[PDB]
Design an enzyme around this catalytic site. Structure first.
Site, mmCIF file in Angstrom:
data_model
loop_
_atom_site.group_PDB
_atom_site.id
_atom_site.type_symbol
_atom_site.label_atom_id
_atom_site.label_comp_id
_atom_site.label_asym_id
_atom_site.label_seq_id
_atom_site.Cartn_x
_atom_site.Cartn_y
_atom_site.Cartn_z
ATOM 1 C CB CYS A 230 21.275 -21.485 56.020
ATOM 2 S SG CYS A 230 19.964 -22.336 55.096
ATOM 3 C CD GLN A 231 21.029 -26.412 61.368
ATOM 4 O OE1 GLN A 231 20.934 -27.501 61.952
ATOM 5 N NE2 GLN A 231 22.101 -25.649 61.509
ATOM 6 C CB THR A 232 17.377 -27.048 56.522
ATOM 7 O OG1 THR A 232 16.615 -25.828 56.456
ATOM 8 C CG2 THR A 232 17.459 -27.504 57.965
ATOM 9 C CG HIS A 233 19.655 -24.918 50.229
ATOM 10 N ND1 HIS A 233 19.250 -25.477 49.037
ATOM 11 C CD2 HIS A 233 20.099 -23.671 49.907
ATOM 12 C CE1 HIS A 233 19.460 -24.626 48.039
ATOM 13 N NE2 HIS A 233 19.984 -23.524 48.554
ATOM 14 C CG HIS A 234 14.150 -21.728 54.916
ATOM 15 N ND1 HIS A 234 13.674 -21.324 56.137
ATOM 16 C CD2 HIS A 234 13.604 -20.887 53.991
ATOM 17 C CE1 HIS A 234 12.858 -20.293 55.968
ATOM 18 N NE2 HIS A 234 12.813 -20.019 54.681
ATOM 19 N NE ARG A 235 18.626 -19.973 58.614
ATOM 20 C CZ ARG A 235 19.447 -20.056 59.654
ATOM 21 N NH1 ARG A 235 19.823 -18.957 60.302
ATOM 22 N NH2 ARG A 235 19.875 -21.252 60.062
ATOM 23 C CB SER A 236 21.475 -20.862 51.784
ATOM 24 O OG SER A 236 21.052 -22.198 52.028
#
Ligand SMILES: [Mg+2]
Ligand SMILES: [Mg+2]
Ligand SMILES: [Mg+2]
Length: 271
Positions: A230-236
């Site tokens: 995602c943007q920072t591998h939080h959502r992903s």
């Protein structure tokens, strides 16, 4: 995996409640300081989500440094027989990211609490405001690169027949309408399935039961290596977790994510 060995990766609140006193259980809460203090699942140990991230330029979504992980995991009581159960209060982004960290440290036994605290609270299950005692000092960890795609690795795989890139950002970010880096758009060949689209709000943010079919519509199938970001591998974190939970054999989290890809000079972008 003792008391948890018969269960699949994604377990329900009922399964966890029956096993709260299992001695091997390391129950990890990645909600917030406020939510954890207001009331957490009994025996849960708080891991502020910020602690799961490097949090420094050029790629803040990378894993934390060794020292921070070794301290964190010693505080949680990491040990050979441990079985982690992980949850958050947002549908599984931080929980799934923490599970990617468990793969990074080589932990084999772990579960995701389906719908996390949302599902727990929806069923009015017991809460605690008590603090467990942290286990102890830092543990010497063996850190693994297998669970993670580097920028260069992903660059070399682009366009492969056997790769699916699961972009877990919002569609507006995927199409470059909402731009959170120097470059807007997505990684060439990537497909989009926003992390929240994978949740079912009518079932307390559990993973939707029709998830497999939806991933297959996008060509995200288990015979391909799945690289998610995602943007920072939080959502992903959530999407990484789902692929693992469905039994996909080849899954990587592109930790650098768009915060890196959207800003790096070498990375091709597609609208
Ligand atoms: Mg939150
Ligand atoms: Mg050392
Ligand atoms: Mg939206």
């Amino acid at each position: 995996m003792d008391d948890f060995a018969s269960l699949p990766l994604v377990i329900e609140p009922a399964d966890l409640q029956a096993r709260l006193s299992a001695p091997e259980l390391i129950l990890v809460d990645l909600t917030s300081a406020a939510r954890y203090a207001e009331g957490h699942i009994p025996g849960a140990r708080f891991v502020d989500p910020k602690r799961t991230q490097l949090g420094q330029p050029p790629a803040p979504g990378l894993q934390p440094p060794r020292e921070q992980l070794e301290s964190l995991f010693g505080e949680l009581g990491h040990r050979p027989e441990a079985v982690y159960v992980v949850y958050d209060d947002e549908g599984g982004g931080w929980a799934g990211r923490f599970i990617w960290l468990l793969d990074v440290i080589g932990q084999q036994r772990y579960h995701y609490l389906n719908g996390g605290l949302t599902a727990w609270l929806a069923e009015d299950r017991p809460l605690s405001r008590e603090l467990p005692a942290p286990a102890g000092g830092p543990v010497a960890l063996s850190l693994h690169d297998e669970p993670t795609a580097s920028r260069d690795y992903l660059l070399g795989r682009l366009g492969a027949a056997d790769l699916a890139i699961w972009d877990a950002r919002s569609p507006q970010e995927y199409r470059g309408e909402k731009v959170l880096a120097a470059k807007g758009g997505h990684i060439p060949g990537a497909v989009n399935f926003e992390w929240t689209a994978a949740m079912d709000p009518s079932r307390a943010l559990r993973i939707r039961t029709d998830i497999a079919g939806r991933l297959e519509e996008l060509g995200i199938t288990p015979d391909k290596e799945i690289v998610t970001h995602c943007q920072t591998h939080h959502r992903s974190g959530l999407t990484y977790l789902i692929a693992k939970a469905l039994g996909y054999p080849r899954v990587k989290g592109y930790a650098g994510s768009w915060g890196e890809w959207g800003n790096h000079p070498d990375t091709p972008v597609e609208l």
